[PDB]
Amino acid sequence: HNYSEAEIKVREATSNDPWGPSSSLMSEIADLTYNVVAFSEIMSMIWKRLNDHGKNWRHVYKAMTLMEYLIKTGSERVSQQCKENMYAVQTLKDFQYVDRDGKDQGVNVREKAKQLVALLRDEDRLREERAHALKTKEKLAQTA
């Protein structure tokens, strides 16, 4: 069918464009993770966007950025499902992409993957990361 609004938001937040996802858009997606229907659509689209290679690395990098944000500020179900699909996060630590100009863009995906896995496996730390992230999200909504 047509994409749901939640799916459209995830695709925009992970678009193959030279700009990272805005905090405002990620915050909207985070709220939608509490919606039982939207949650599954959101997660599925993120896993799909992470499934890419080489020159399409921005899809992957931005999808990881969004996943990190949702792990920290969305429903606790996000982190739960990421832990259950840990392998799919771990594989990204080996992603490679050096462009035609010889510049290593893939090292960025590898670095973010490494720190994303650490965030998911360090259980005591996740509690503190969520508290700080949620406070940051609250301030975002209370500022222009």
Side-chain angles (χ1 to χ4, degrees), residues 37-86:
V37 176
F39 173 81
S40 295
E41 299 176 335
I42 289 165
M43 295 305 297
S44 180
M45 190 60 69
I46 292 181
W47 293 122
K48 176 184 169 186
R49 276 284 156 97
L50 287 166
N51 189 2
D52 224 315
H53 309 277
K55 69 179 183 179
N56 293 329
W57 69 277
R58 289 182 182 75
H59 277 319
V60 186
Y61 188 78
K62 293 173 69 170
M64 274 199 297
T65 297
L66 172 59
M67 195 64 104
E68 174 192 357
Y69 187 96
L70 299 184
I71 282 163
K72 292 174 173 180
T73 71
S75 166
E76 301 191 72
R77 294 186 62 206
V78 178
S79 64
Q80 178 182 65
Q81 183 175 123
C82 286
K83 292 177 185 176
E84 293 173 357
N85 193 34
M86 180 60 65

Side-chain angles (χ1 to χ4, degrees), residues 1-5 7-8 11 37 41 45 48:
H1 303 189
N2 297 308
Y3 287 128
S4 64
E5 186 53 47
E7 294 177 307
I8 291 296
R11 291 175 68 76
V37 176
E41 299 176 335
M45 190 60 69
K48 176 184 169 186

Side-chain angles (χ1 to χ4, degrees), residues 46 48 107 134 142:
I46 292 181
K48 176 184 169 186
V107 67
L134 287 171
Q142 307 174 308

Side-chain angles (χ1 to χ4, degrees), residues 22-38:
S22 74
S23 287
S24 179
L25 178 54
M26 296 196 283
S27 181
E28 292 187 308
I29 298 169
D31 289 329
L32 289 167
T33 61
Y34 285 93
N35 180 296
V36 68
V37 176

